[PDB]
Amino acid sequence: QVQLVQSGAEVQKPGASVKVSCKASGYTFASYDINWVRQATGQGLEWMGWMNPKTGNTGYAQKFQGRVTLTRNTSISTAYMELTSLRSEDTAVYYCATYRIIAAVGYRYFQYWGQGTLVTVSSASTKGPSVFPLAPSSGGTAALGCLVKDYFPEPVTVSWNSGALTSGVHTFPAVLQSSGLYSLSSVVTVPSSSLGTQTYICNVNHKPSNTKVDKRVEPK
Amino acid sequence: XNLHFCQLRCKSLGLLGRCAXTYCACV
Amino acid sequence: VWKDADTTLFCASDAKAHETEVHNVWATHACVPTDPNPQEIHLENVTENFNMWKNNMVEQMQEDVISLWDQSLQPCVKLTGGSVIKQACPKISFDPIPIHYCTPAGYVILKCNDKNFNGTGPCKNVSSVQCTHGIKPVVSTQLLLNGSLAEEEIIIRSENLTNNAKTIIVHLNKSVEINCTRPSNDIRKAYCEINGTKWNKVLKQVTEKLKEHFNNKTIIFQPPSGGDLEITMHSFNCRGEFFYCNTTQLFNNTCIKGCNGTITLPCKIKQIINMWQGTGQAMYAPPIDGKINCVSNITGILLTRDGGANNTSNETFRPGGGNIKDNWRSELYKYKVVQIE
Amino acid sequence: DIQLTQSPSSLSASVGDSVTITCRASQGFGNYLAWYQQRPGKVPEVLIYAATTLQSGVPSRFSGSGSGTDFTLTISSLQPEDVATYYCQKYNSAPFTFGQGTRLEIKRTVAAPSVFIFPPSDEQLKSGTASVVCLLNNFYPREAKVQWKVDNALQSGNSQESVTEQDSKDSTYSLSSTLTLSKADYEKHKVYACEVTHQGLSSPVTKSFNRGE
Ligand SMILES: *[C@@H]1O[C@H](CO)[C@@H](O)[C@H](O)[C@H]1NC(C)=O
Ligand SMILES: *[C@@H]1O[C@H](CO)[C@@H](O)[C@H](O)[C@H]1NC(C)=O
Ligand SMILES: *[C@@H]1O[C@H](CO)[C@@H](O)[C@H](O)[C@H]1NC(C)=O
Ligand SMILES: *[C@@H]1O[C@H](CO)[C@@H](O)[C@H](O)[C@H]1NC(C)=O
Ligand SMILES: *[C@@H]1O[C@H](CO)[C@@H](O)[C@H](O)[C@H]1NC(C)=O
Ligand SMILES: *[C@@H]1O[C@H](CO)[C@@H](O)[C@H](O)[C@H]1NC(C)=O
Ligand SMILES: *[C@@H]1O[C@H](CO)[C@@H](O)[C@H](O)[C@H]1NC(C)=O
Ligand SMILES: *[C@@H]1O[C@H](CO)[C@@H](O)[C@H](O)[C@H]1NC(C)=O
Ligand SMILES: *[C@@H]1O[C@H](CO)[C@@H](O)[C@H](O)[C@H]1NC(C)=O
Ligand SMILES: *[C@@H]1O[C@H](CO)[C@@H](O)[C@H](O)[C@H]1NC(C)=O
Ligand SMILES: *[C@@H]1O[C@H](CO)[C@@H](O)[C@H](O)[C@H]1NC(C)=O
Ligand SMILES: *[C@@H]1O[C@H](CO)[C@@H](O)[C@H](O)[C@H]1NC(C)=O
C-alpha cells in the first residue's frame, strides 16, 4: 500500500549543496507530515527535521537548522530535502519517513521509511565499475563471483542472472581501495552439477554513472 | 475556608456565610 | 471507539532554562518543551457531551498552579493547620507563561470549536488534539486577565443559574486594557486605570446578554456583600507583589448617557494575605522603590446572583471569585480527555 | 529538555536466550516512545509504539514495557533473524529524538570456513593489473587471519579483506581477502597461496595454485 521513493545516490565536494527528493504514494499526501533522518559512517540514526505539506512550516534540530531546507510540491506528492556547506563528516545515508495512516492524533511514530539515499561528500569524481569474472577451479561445491573494481561513489546494485540466483549469493561490503576507489566483489555457491547446465551471469548497476554491465563468468 | 468562623463573622453584618474557595463570603 | 477517562496529563511550555523567573523555573521541570506542529484533527461530523464543571483537567491544573506558587513564592511565614512554619522570602521576577496540557499515548483531548458554547452539553464541531493551548495560570479575583476570548458573542457560563451559590463566568468578545501602577516617590499605595468609554461599552453588552438569560429583567450591579478582602477586592498579582483593587467605581450603574473616560480605582499591596492554595494566612515583604506596573487584558468577570428576585423585576449581580478552579474552568471549558486504542 | 539514554550500546546472546534493551528519559513525555529494528543494510521497522503497544505483523516475543522515564524492550526467545540494531525514539512532538542504538550479535556453534581461491582472468591482466581473491564461507566466530604467500614469500600491505554482516539464518560470516598486484609482479611468479587461520580449523589451512595451470 503506502510507499516512499527517494532520489538516486549522489556525490558532492566539501561545501556544494545537495537536493534529495522523496516521492510518496498510497495515501493523501496532504494530511501527514514528512520527516528526514540520516545515518552517518558507523553511527546511529539522527532525526534532522519535520516538514508539514498543508502549511509548509518546517522545524529542525539545533545541530542542523541554518543548513537544511525542506520544500514540497503537493501536485507530484514529492517532499524535497536540501543540505548546504557539507563536510567529510556529512557523508551519510538520508531517509524520508512518515507517520502511520490514521485520522486520530498520537500516531506520529515513523511506520513508512524510504529506501535511503547515500550522499558521498568527497573531492573525487564518478568512475566506471570495471567488472571482471571469478571462475571455478572446486571447494566441495561450486564458487563463482563478479569482481567490481576501481570506481566511485557507492552504491553498486548486484543481481545474479537478473535476480534469479539469491540463495548462496554474498554481496560483500565495498572497500575504499588506496587509489581512492571503492572496490567490491559479489560471489555465489551453487551445486557443481549445474556449472555447464545453467549459465551464471552477474548484473551490476552504478547509478552515479548510469552505466550497467552484464558479465558471463566462464568456468575456466 | 473556616466555615463556622465565616458564618459567625458574616452574622456580624446580619448576612449568611459561604466559603468562596479558601476565603469567606457574606450574603 | 472512544470513552471518557480521567488519566494523568503532562504540561508543555516554551520555557527558557537560563531565566530565574518562577514560572520558567517551575515549568523547566514538570513540563516538557512544546509541540511546534500541534496536530488538530476535525472529527468528521461527530457530536459529544462536554461538562466544564465535572472536568478533571481543572483539578490537575489546580494542583500544578498550587505546586508552582508555594514552592517558588517564598513566604516569610505560613499559618494553616494548627502549625506555624518559618522560611526566607527573597523577592523574585513574576510573569505567567502559557502552559499546554497534554494526554499520554492511549488518550486524546476532544475540543469544542462551537463559536458560542457555555461549557455544558452537546458540541457538534468536535475536534481532537493531543495537547491544549497557551493557558497562562493567571490567579485573580472578580476579573479574569490575559485569558481566551469568545469568538463571536458574549457567553455566560454557570453550573446552575437558579443556584445562586454557583459562580457565573462571563466570557467577553472584547479585550479591555487595565493599567495598574505602584509608582516611586505612600509605599503600599497603588492605583489602576481603565478606559471608561471602552469599558462601559463592554458592560452595556454584558448586561444586555445577562438580560437575554433573564426574561427582559432590569440588570443591577452592586459592590460585593461581605467577607475576606481577597473577594471584596479584585486581588491579582504584579512582579510578585499582590495588588488589591476596589471595583465599586468600576460597576457604575449611572455611567451607562454622558458619563466620562479614564476610570481610576484605588488598589493597594498587602504583605499578609489568605492563601488560595489552602485555608490559612501568609506573611510577605514589601517592594523596593521600583515603578511596579502590569498592563492586563480583561477577558471575563466572576459574578454572583442574589435571591430577592423571586419578587421585584430587577436581578442584582455582585463581583465574585475565590474559587480559583473557576479561573482554570474559564480556559479548559472546550476541552475534555478521552481514551482511544 | 528531553534526553533519551539507550543502553547497552552493544549486546551478545545465543539463540533462544532472553535479552533486554533499556531507554531512560530526562523527564516524562506521556509514553510516546517507539522501538525500531534496523536489520543489517535494511530500513527501520517500528516493532513497538505507545511505549508498550505491539505493532501488528511483528512477533509477540518482542515486548515493550515501562512508563514515564523508564522503558525496556525485551526479546523473550531470541532467534537468528533478530541480528540487527534497535533504537528507542520519542514521538510526543518534535524533536522526534532517536536513542544512541543497540547492536545485537548472536553467539553460536563454531562453524569452520570453506576456503576458495580465484586467480584473476586475462581481462584484468590486459588492463595491466593482477587481482587474486581468497574467500572464507559460512564461518563463526568473526576472528579470521588470512596470510598471502607469493612463491611462499609472505606479503603485507598488498591485501585488503572484508566480511559480510552476521547471516539472518545460520548467523555466519564470509570474509573476502583480495591481493592486488601489477601484471609485471604476476608474470615474475608462479605460486599464489592464501593461508587461513580459523579456530574451527585444527591447524592453518592453505588453498593455492600455480599461474598458467
Ligand atoms: C511541481 O513540479 C512541476 C514539474 O513537473 C511544475 O511544473 C509545477 O509548477 C510544480 N509546482 C510547484 C508548486 O512547485
Ligand atoms: C469547525 O471548526 C472551526 C471553527 O473554529 C472551523 O475552521 C471549521 O470550518 C468548523 N467546521 C464545521 C463543520 O463547523
Ligand atoms: C449551556 O449550553 C447548552 C447547549 O450546549 C444549553 O443547552 C444550556 O442551556 C447552556 N447553559 C446555560 C447555563 O446557559
Ligand atoms: C459581542 O457580543 C455582544 C452581545 O453578545 C454583541 O452585541 C457584540 O456586537 C459582539 N461583538 C463585538 C463587540 O465584537
Ligand atoms: C423562587 O426561589 C427559588 C429558590 O429555590 C428559585 O430557584 C426560583 O427561581 C424561584 N421560583 C419561583 C417560581 O419563584
Ligand atoms: C439547581 O439549583 C437549585 C437550587 O439550589 C436546585 O434545587 C436544583 O435541583 C439544581 N438543579 C440541578 C440540575 O442540579
Ligand atoms: C493582550 O494585550 C496585548 C498588549 O500587549 C495585546 O497586544 C493583545 O492583543 C491582547 N490579547 C488579548 C487576548 O486580549
Ligand atoms: C500606565 O500608566 C503609567 C503612568 O501612571 C505609564 O507607565 C503609562 O501611561 C501606562 N503604561 C502602559 C504600558 O500603558
Ligand atoms: C478611550 O477609548 C476611546 C474609544 O476607543 C478612545 O477614542 C480614546 O482615545 C481612549 N482614551 C484615551 C485617553 O486613551
Ligand atoms: C470602595 O470605595 C468606596 C469609596 O468611594 C467605599 O464606599 C468602599 O467601602 C470601598 N470598598 C472596599 C471593599 O474597600
Ligand atoms: C459613577 O458615576 C457618577 C455619575 O453619576 C460619578 O460619581 C462617577 O463617575 C462614578 N462614581 C462612583 C462612586 O463610582
Ligand atoms: C498579563 O499580561 C501582561 C503582558 O500583556 C503581563 O505584564 C502581566 O503581568 C499579566 N498579568 C498578570 C496578572 O500576571
Residue C313, Ramachandran bin (φ over 0: left; ψ between -120 and 50: alpha; else beta): alpha
- Chain B contact partners (≥3 CB pairs within 8 A): C
Cis peptide before A129 (omega within 30 of 0): no
Q: How remote is the CA of residue C130 from the centroid of ligand 3, in Å?
A: 26
Cell of C141: 479575583
| C177/C296 Cα distance (integer angstroms) | 6
Cell of D123: 581481462
Q: Which residues pair with D208 in a beta bridge?
A: D193
Three-state secondary structure string covering chain C: CCEECCCCCEEECCCCCCCCCHHHHHHHCCEECCCCCCCCCCCCCCCCEEEHHHCHHHHHHHHHHHHHHHHHCCCCEEECCCCEEECCCCCCCCCCCCEEEECCCCEEEEEECCCCCCCEEECCCEEEECECCCECCCCCCCEEECCCCCCCCCEEECCCCCCCCCCEEEEEEEEEEEEEEECCCCCCECEEEECHHHHHHHHHHHHHHHHHHCCCCEEEECCCCEECHHHHCECCCCCCCCEEECCCCCCCCCCCCCCCCCEEECCEECCEEECCCCCCEEECCCCCCCCEEEEEEEEEEEEEECCCCCCCCEEEEEECCCCHHHHHHCCCCCEEEEECC
Q: How remote is the CA of residue A212 from the centroid of ligand 12, in Å?
A: 69
Residue of D nearest to C17 (CA): D1
Ligand nearest to the Cα of C193, by number: 8
Resolution in A: 3.0
| A125/A117 Cα distance (integer angstroms) | 18
Ligand nearest to the Cα of C209, by number: 4
Angle (nearest 5°) at CA D167 between D162 and D168? 150
Helix (H), strand (E) at residue A170: strand A170-171
Helix (H), strand (E) at residue B5: helix B3-11
- Pocket probe mutation, ligand 2, options C40, C41, C42, C124, max atoms within 8 Å of Cβ: C42
Ligand 8 contact via C195 beta carbon (within 6 Å):
no
Q: Is A190 touching D (CB cutoff 8 A)?
A: no
Residue whose C-alpha is closest to residue D175's, from D158, D209, D193, D198: D198
D144/chain A closest Cα distance in angstroms: 16
D2/chain A closest Cα distance in angstroms: 13
- For residue D34, give the 3-state DSSP assignment: strand
CA separation, residue C308 to residues B18, C22, C311, C316 (Å): 17, 45, 6, 9
- For residue D77, give the 3-state DSSP assignment: coil
Strand D84-90 to D102-107 pairing: antiparallel
| A219/A133 Cα distance (integer angstroms) | 9
Across C284-298, b (16+ Cβ under 10 Å) vs e yields beebeeeebebebbb
CB-CB under 8 Å, C107 with A106: yes
Ligand nearest to the Cα of A53, by number: 1
Residue whose C-alpha is closest to residue A35's, from D46, C12, D67: D46
Q: How remote is the CA of residue C261 from the centroid of ligand 7, in Å?
A: 21
Residues with Cβ within 8 Å of D211's Cβ and at least 6 positions away in sequence, in order, are D119, D186, D187, D189, D190, D192
Nearest-by-Cβ selection for A104 from C36, C37, C128: C128
Nearest-by-Cβ selection for D87 from A44, A172, A174: A44
Neighbours of D101 (CB within 10 A): 19
Residue of C nearest to B1 (CA): C279
Check: CB of residue C116 under 8 Å from CB of residue C340.
no
Q: How many CB pairs under 8 A join A and D?
A: 127
C130/chain A closest Cα distance in angstroms: 6
Specify whether domain A124-220 bears CATH 2.60.40.10.
Answer: yes
Helix (H), strand (E) at residue B3: helix B3-11
Measure the CA dihedral A178/A179/A181/A186, to 10°. -60
Ligand 11 contact via C80 beta carbon (within 6 Å):
no
Residues of C (98-127) whose Cβ lies below 8 Å from A: 103, 105-108
Q: Is C38 exposed, middle or buried (0-12, 13-18, 19+ CB in 10 A)?
A: middle
Measure the CA dihedral A138/A139/A142/A147, to 10°. -100
Ligand 9 contact via C197 beta carbon (within 6 Å):
yes
CB-CB under 8 Å, A45 with D36: yes
Cis peptide before A153 (omega within 30 of 0): yes
Look at domain D108-213 and name its CATH class: mainly beta
| C179/C293 Cα distance (integer angstroms) | 7
C339/chain D closest Cα distance in angstroms: 13
CB-CB under 8 Å, C29 with D31: no
Helix (H), strand (E) at residue B18: strand B17-20
Phi/psi of residue C286, nearest 5 degrees: -80, 180
- Residue corresponding to grid cell 458573542: C153
Q: Is C18 exposed, middle or buried (0-12, 13-18, 19+ CB in 10 A)?
A: exposed
The residue ranges of every structural domain in chain A are: 1-123, 124-220
| D180/A183 Cα distance (integer angstroms) | 11
Q: After which residues does chain D become discontinuous at a C–N distance over 2.5 Å?
A: none
Going by CA atoms, what residue is nearest to atom 10 of ligand 10? C246
What technique determined this structure? X-ray
Ligand 2 contact via C181 beta carbon (within 6 Å):
no
Termini Cα distance of chain B: 15
- Residue corresponding to grid cell 557523508: A91
Q: Is A61 touching D (CB cutoff 8 A)?
A: yes
Check: CB of residue A194 under 8 Å from CB of residue A144.
no
Ligand nearest to the Cα of C308, by number: 5
Termini Cα distance of chain A: 47
- Find the farthest-apart pair of alpha carbons in chain B and give their distance in angstroms, rounded: 22
Q: Is A25 exposed, middle or buried (0-12, 13-18, 19+ CB in 10 A)?
A: exposed
Q: Which atom of ligand 1 is nearest to the CA of A76?
A: 1
Long-range contacts of C125-128 (CB under 8 A, 24+ apart): C126/C43, C126/C46, C126/C47, C126/C48, C127/C40, C127/C41, C127/C42, C127/C43, C128/A104, C128/A105, C128/C40, C128/C41, C128/C43, C128/C338
